Design a protein around this ligand. Structure first.
Ligand SMILES: *[C@@H]1O[C@H](CO)[C@@H](O[C@@H]2O[C@H](CO)[C@@H](O[C@@H]3O[C@H](CO)[C@@H](O)[C@H](O[C@H]4O[C@H](CO)[C@@H](O)[C@H](O)[C@@H]4O)[C@@H]3O[C@@H]3OC[C@@H](O)[C@H](O)[C@H]3O)[C@H](O)[C@H]2NC(C)=O)[C@H](O[C@@H]2O[C@@H](C)[C@@H](O)[C@@H](O)[C@@H]2O)[C@H]1NC(C)=O
Ligand SMILES: OC[C@H]1O[C@@H](O[C@H]2[C@H](O)[C@H](O)[C@H](O)O[C@@H]2CO)[C@H](O)[C@@H](O)[C@H]1O
Ligand SMILES: OC[C@H]1O[C@@H](O[C@H]2[C@H](O)[C@H](O)[C@H](O)O[C@@H]2CO)[C@H](O)[C@@H](O)[C@H]1O
Ligand SMILES: *[C@@H]1O[C@H](CO)[C@@H](O)[C@H](O)[C@H]1NC(C)=O
Ligand SMILES: [Ca+2]
Ligand SMILES: [Ca+2]
Ligand SMILES: [Mn+2]
Ligand SMILES: [Mn+2]
Ligand code: NA
Lengths: 239, 239
């Protein structure tokens, strides 16, 4: 069995196990600020930032036909400090082709280039979307399972606990082809779940990068924090 | 859309919306004790108890082919206070034929009669199993998805937080046929998930009872509490 796993209980600046793209920085206190926080402590609009795990993950093999099972977990907080305009745009965990660079910001969350359903993306993502774009359901925030498109195949509305920490669990079972995501707010005890059938060999390349991305909006103060406090991942490819 | 739903933030004695079976009592403090607590506060062995919602739930319709989606949530605690022997047996949420009475206790959890795979059970269940029977995985406790058998089609080990309250979310989407279950321990933050494909059209009857059952073990002090503090449910049958 070919397995790979990492576990960041906090984030430390400088360590070359994570690549920081765009606006993403790691604070001295250990927080991954995906999008920019101004000097006054307020989130900046027109910001996009990602991080990628530096080593690639073997997810499936075309010769042997085997598909890996995987699971990722992270804790994040989104603080929306303004009533007007609406906050934007969200954060997302995404898996796709290696050596990728930040795509379009705003409602494309740094992962996609437009709203088109296109297999050439080769990207699977679980989004936590805070702004209702024309391709979105009306309710925000919502969890979404994104398969080669920012237009989710499945969405689940959830109520933001503004400024508080959420715990995310995402798991894929290759035998059932079930992709599963759970959000828990320890502050309130709220639990949200979403699941859908994802055939990974049809979606992802054989080797992928895993990463996290966030984006703020396209007009002044259409913004919110996208802080991540911890991140772990594990995959096991049968041989 | 044919919809049914209930919600108990606590339980009160006498409420005719819940039928109590076997050893199940509702204390004055509002707790549903599925299995017998002795007068010294210690859980009794050789105990089986269940509760049923008094109204049936329309899960699917034969003439139209539509299948309902549903979700249940409850909080429970299991305390294992004896150092010997091993505790037993667990508790379970189950859906099956209406007007049912308690089945066999011990490892059958008050829901099944034997360890057979028998489609005439017509019973779907999500178990939280504390004793490893010959048909069980070796790890206990574990979550299990039971389809017409106490022999789970899928299990997930989890670590008991002795005496602490756990929150359970169980969700079924009829379109993807994904049955999902989540357990969260607020006391520790632990999160556990499990999911598997279930075609309730081939499993459950058209109308079902929903319920909770618990059982202690078959020898002295092979026992533990099975207390439930809240229970909610919701099903929506498309038309
Ligand atoms: C969202 O949009 C991003 C911005 O466009 C995409 O990124 C760009 O992707 C293109 C590939 O389509 C990259 O361009 C290539 O760069 C390589 C390496 O230098 C060149 O070898 C390659 O050129 C050769 O192939 C071309 C056909 O593709 C031929 O036309 C050409 O003659 C060569 O034979 C090509 O470079 C371009 O060639 C055409 C010229 O007009 C152009 O000037 C020149 O750049 C490009 O580098 C890349 N940009 C960035 C910032 O990454 C992005 O695409 C995804 O990511 C890239 C890296 C690839 O992995 C794609 O397969 C993938 O789709 C896309 N993002 C997503 C998620 O879709
Ligand atoms: O307000 C945040 C959203 O902005 C969207 O872009 C809009 C932009 O703010 C401006 O108003 C422009 O004139 O219109 C576009 C809408 O097409 C952005 O697409 C969305 O994701 C949010 O960031
Ligand atoms: O110890 C608890 C378990 O008991 C199991 O029954 C056993 C019983 O305890 C006694 O030892 C008897 O002689 O053997 C049986 C095993 O067949 C019970 O089946 C299990 O669910 C637990 O309750
Ligand atoms: C389970 O036991 C009860 C009581 O004997 C019986 O009525 C029921 O038909 C049994 N079901 C199965 C599948 O054996
Ligand atoms: Ca959006
Ligand atoms: Ca058992
Ligand atoms: Mn969305
Ligand atoms: Mn079991
Ligand atoms: Na905060």
């Amino acid at each position: 069995v070919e397995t790979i796993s990492f576990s960041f209980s906090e984030f430390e600046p400088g360590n070359n196990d994570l690549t920081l793209q765009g606006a993403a920085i790691i604070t001295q206190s250990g927080v991954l600020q995906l999008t920019k926080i101004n000097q006054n402590g307020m989130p900046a609009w027109d910001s996009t930032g990602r991080t990628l795990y530096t080593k690639p993950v073997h997810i499936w093999d075309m010769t042997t036909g085997t598909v890996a099972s995987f699971e990722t977990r992270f804790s994040f907080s989104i603080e929306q400090p303004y009533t007007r305009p609406l906050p934007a745009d969200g954060l997302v965990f995404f898996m796709g082709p290696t050596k990728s660079k930040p795509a379009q910001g705003y409602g494309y969350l740094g992962v996609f280039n437009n709203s088109k359903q296109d297999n050439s993306y080769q990207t699977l993502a679980v989004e936590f979307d805070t702004f209702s774009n024309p391709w979105d359901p009306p309710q925000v925030p919502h969890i979404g399972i994104d398969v080669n498109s920012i237009r989710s195949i499945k969405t689940q509305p959830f109520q933001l606990d503004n400024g508080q920490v959420a715990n995310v669990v995402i798991k894929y079972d290759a035998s059932s082809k079930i992709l599963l995501a759970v959000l828990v707010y320890p502050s309130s005890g709220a639990i949200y779940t979403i699941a859908e059938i994802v055939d990974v060999k049809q979606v992802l390349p054989e080797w992928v990068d895993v990463g996290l991305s966030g984006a703020t909006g396209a007009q002044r103060d259409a913004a919110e924090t996208h802080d991540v406090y911890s991140w772990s991942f594990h995959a096991s490819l049968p041989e």
